[PDB]
Write a protein that binds this ligand. Structure first.
Ligand SMILES: Cc1cc2nc3c(=O)[nH]c(=O)nc-3n(C[C@H](O)[C@H](O)[C@H](O)COP(=O)(O)O)c2cc1C
Ligand SMILES: Cn1cc(-c2cc(C(N)=O)nc3cc(CN4CCO[C@H](C(F)(F)F)C4)ccc23)cn1
Length: 389
């Protein structure tokens, strides 16, 4: 009578041993760039989740009792939640540190502010910003700041007996109300000369109109004297605090925190369910998974939210394109869940079939995380150590 359990137990043991091997390779090479360069704590949380997926088999195969019924209810949702919260936090981290995007609008005649913007654009590019540099002469005011996390306005000072903004910049300055500067993080720069009474008067003028509109001036204006090439060290130095506006780093403790919050969401659903509907029997558990689908809905949200963010952040090259492999993991995950959920529905009337299918789908969900995400990571660590130094 235990024949039906041989196949699922074999998968579960092979899968558990693979997950342990992956953890072993990772912990042995813990300070290595492949393991350190991304969400290290998140990849250990993820492995724990994959280990729990395989272990769920032993709970499905077990004879129903108060303890087994508790474990099943609590575990099915939790196992998945650990995986999909670690994965969502990984893509969320990628989306903040590389998702960030900046816009540079400059007004230049002799190419001085046009050079300042080029060297600023390079420094921001180096900080994982999708930088877009645009001359003011070829800029239309209406909704120009929309979609941008950071906006840098560059302008030289002109006018003989008084201050005057650079020729190309004036229309943009005149219709500044229309760009969407309210609540936007901004910073001004510009080239001028100290032989002139009002050194960089254009910067002061732009800073002040931005202030009235309700813009968030992150840093004080960069006012350069003479040739910008000789003040290059201060330009790049100014770029060090403008890049700071949108965080370029989420701390290891913060990653763990947001991941633990999302897992806690599942816990609260399935613990609250257990206290309302007391676990027990009388062959079968008292409260089936179909009696309350709130645990499943939460994991479907996590999968949906994750797959959205994974696709949006796919082209990121950080940590040997881990973003691409999270993509594959997630596209494969959707396919498993879209194929199995209808099977469970149309098969709900045969318990041994439900149990057996659950052993296959939960383990397959684990195997996909090991195959798409970890196997490529493993191949570099073990067979390409020169690429891991
Ligand atoms: C007609 C004229 C007016 C200027 N007025 C000012 C001024 O009031 N304040 C200032 O700091 N620089 C002033 N300058 C200096 C220019 O801003 C400087 O040459 C600048 O580096 C040009 O930058 P751009 O290539 O970005 O246009 C003036 C220069 C000229 C010839
Ligand atoms: C890949 N994979 C996901 C799971 C899984 C996961 C979860 C969860 N807690 O996150 N809860 C499940 C509940 C059930 C019960 N069905 C009874 C009849 O059908 C119903 C519906 F609506 F889905 F059709 C639901 C079945 C499978 C569940 C297993 N494998």
């Amino acid at each position: 009578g235990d024949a039906w359990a041989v196949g699922p137990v074999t998968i579960a043991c092979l899968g558990a041993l693979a997950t342990l091997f992956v953890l072993g390779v990772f912990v042995r090479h813990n300070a290595t760039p492949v393991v350190k360069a991304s969400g290290r704590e998140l990849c250990y949380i993820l492995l724990g989740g994959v280990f729990l997926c395989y272990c769920m088999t032993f709970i499905f195969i077990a004879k129903p009792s108060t303890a087994v019924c508790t474990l099943r209810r609590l575990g099915l949702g939790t196992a998945f939640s650990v995986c999909y919260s670690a994965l969502l936090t990984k893509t969320y981290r990628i989306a903040r540190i590389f998702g960030a995007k900046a816009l540079i609008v400059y007004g230049s005649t002799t190419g001085n502010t046009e050079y300042t913007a080029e060297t600023i654009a390079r420094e921001l590019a180096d900080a994982g910003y999708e930088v877009d540099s645009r001359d003011a002469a070829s800029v239309e005011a209406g909704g120009l700041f929309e979609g941008f996390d950071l906006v840098l306005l560059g302008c030289s000072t002109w006018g003989d007996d008084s201050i005057e903004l650079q020729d190309d910049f004036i229309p943009l300055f005149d219709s500044l109300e229309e760009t969407g500067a309210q609540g936007r993080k901004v910073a001004c720069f510009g080239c001028g000369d100290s032989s002139w009474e009002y050194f960089c008067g254009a910067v002061d003028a732009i800073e002040e109109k931005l202030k009235n509109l309700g813009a968030e001036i992150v840093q004080d204006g960069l006012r350069i004297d003479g040739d910008p090439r000789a003040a290059r060290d201060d330009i790049v130095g100014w770029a060090h605090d403008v890049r700071g506006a949108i965080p370029r780093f989420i701390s290891p403790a913060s990653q763990v925190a947001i991941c633990l919050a999302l897992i806690s969401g599942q816990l609260l659903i399935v613990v609250a369910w257990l206290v309302v509907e007391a676990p027990g029997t009388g062959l079968r558990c008292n409260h089936r998974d179909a009696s309350m689908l709130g645990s499943l809905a939460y994991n479907v949200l996590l999968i949906a939210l994750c797959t959205l963010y994974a696709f949006k952040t796919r082209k990121c090259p950080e940590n040997f394109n881990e973003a691409k492999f999270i993509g594959f993991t997630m596209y494969t995950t959707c396919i498993i869940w879209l194929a199995f959920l209808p099977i469970f529905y149309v098969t709900s009337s045969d318990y041994r079939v439900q149990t057996t299918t659950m052993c296959v789908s939960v383990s397959l969900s684990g195997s996909v995380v090991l195959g798409c995400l970890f196997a490529p990571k493993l191949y570099i660590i073990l067979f390409q150590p020169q690429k891991n130094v």
